[model samples]
Target: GDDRKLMKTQEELTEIVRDHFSDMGEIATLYVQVYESSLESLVGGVIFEDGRHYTFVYENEDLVYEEEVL
Candidate 1:
């Protein structure tokens, strides 16, 4: 399970997303997107990490939302 990470609930993930995006004035809004395949599966809008910004495509137990860090 080394590749696997601790699970984070939707609420927890939302906090992380907002905390990061709040700094970006360009980011007008942020929200969760539920996948058609799974209701529990959803990803945050814009993700900022490290030194780069990222756009999320899918939501899983792994990375709810992540950004690239340089």
Candidate 2:
């Protein structure tokens, strides 16, 4: 996909994730990662509202999501 689409997707995805984590705490920071291959895709990441770090990887049509509490 194009950067424009990617940006929109990232924004939407970020909001979706944020909504789900709204109860966690106030958002402190947000991070988004993108992968460029023969085709472009997105891998969204986030730094927790209260604490901890999280990473999400998108492969094909599946998502590999992970989180670390520190």
- State which candidate has the highest TM-score: 2
For each of the candidates, give the backbone clash count: 1, 0
- lDDT of all predictions, in order shown? 0.53, 0.59
- Runs of candidate 2 exceeding 4 Å displacement: 1-8, 35-42, 57-64
Model 2 lDDT per residue over 1-70, tens place = 5565323455565555567557655657766666443443456666764676777665545656688645
| Model 2, residue 36: C-alpha shift (Å) | 9.1
What TM-score fits each model?
A: 0.39, 0.45
- lDDT of each residue in 1-70, candidate 1, tens digit only: 3865556566765665566557654554457764333233445456334334565544444444455455
Cα displacement (angstroms), candidate 2, residue 54, comes to 1.7
In model 1, the runs with Cα more than 4 Å from the true position are 1-6, 35-42, 46-54, 57-70
lDDT for position 1 in model 2: 55
